[PDB]
């Protein structure tokens, strides 16, 4: 996250921490994820399709630090890694980028819901906020470009959605935003999602409640004039994600 604040894991309580196994014994975060029912964390394939054996991951729930524990967090193995097969990937763009980790503890249980551990809701079909809604994103990833390291806290910031009208104008993304997908950023170009932050949430106020609007997926650079963080748009994808949950 470029910019934003810090923040716990009290805030977005949803919120999964991924990493992965090396040949070595040596653990490094992938990416984000979000608790969407007690056994199940939904994500972005990209994280995954380079080593898609499911036995190499660690699933992390009540998670604020990157490299320490937090009190009350619960850690997992991922039972079932479910990538999109109608995944596919150019440049820039990432399509139907979208997975789901079925988790379980050593003992065989899923998650307990907690203070700091609880489930996000999914969208009602088809149904997005407004462009121009403020939408909140959280995730470990970079928070400049350039840094070699990731943030040891978690952090939060906030974008607002753009339509999809203005995010295939050419000099932002053209064609490679499609319907599927959902773009947001900040007016003054300041604050983003960035390397790291990838399958993380981004969520809205929808019907009164907060909803998985998003999932970070893409960009060109982070925080970048006329480069918004483009998103898995989780409203298109119901059929996809009951049907493999
Ligand atoms: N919201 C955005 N503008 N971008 C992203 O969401 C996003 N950006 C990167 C990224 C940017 C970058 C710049 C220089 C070198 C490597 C980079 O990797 C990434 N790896 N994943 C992402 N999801």
Redesign the pocket.
């Known amino acids: 996250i470029i910019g934003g604040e810090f923040t716990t894991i009290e805030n977005q309580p949803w919120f999964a921490a991924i990493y992965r196994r090396h040949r070595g014994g040596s653990v490094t975060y992938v990416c984000g994820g979000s608790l969407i029912s007690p056994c199940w964390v939904i994500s972005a394939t990209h994280c995954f399709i380079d080593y898609p054996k499911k036995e190499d991951y660690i699933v992390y729930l009540g998670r604020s630090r990157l490299n320490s524990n937090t009190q009350g967090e619960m850690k997992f193995e991922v039972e079932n890694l479910i990538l999109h097969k109608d995944y596919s990937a150019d440049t820039l763009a990432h399509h139907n980028d979208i997975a789901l980790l079925k988790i379980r503890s050593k003992e065989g249980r899923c998650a307990q819901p907690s203070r700091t551990i609880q489930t996000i809701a999914l969208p009602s079909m088809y149904n997005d906020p407004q462009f121009g809604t403020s939408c909140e994103i959280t995730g470990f990833?970079k928070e400049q470009?350039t840094d070699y390291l990731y943030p040891e806290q978690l952090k939060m910031t906030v974008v607002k959605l753009i339509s999809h009208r203005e995010c295939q104008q050419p000099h932002y993304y053209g064609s490679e935003v499609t319907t599927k997908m959902l773009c947001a950023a900040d007016p003054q170009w300041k604050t983003?999602?960035?390397?790291?932050?990838?399958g993380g949430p981004l969520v809205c106020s929808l019907q009164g409640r907060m909803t998985l609007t998003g999932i970070?997926?893409?960009?060109?650079?982070?925080?970048?004039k006329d480069?918004?963080?483009?998103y898995t748009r989780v409203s298109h994808f119901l059929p996809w994600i009951r049907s493999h949950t």
């Open positions: 990833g470009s983003d999602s960035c390397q790291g932050d990838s970070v997926s893409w960009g060109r650079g982070c925080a970048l480069k918004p963080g483009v």
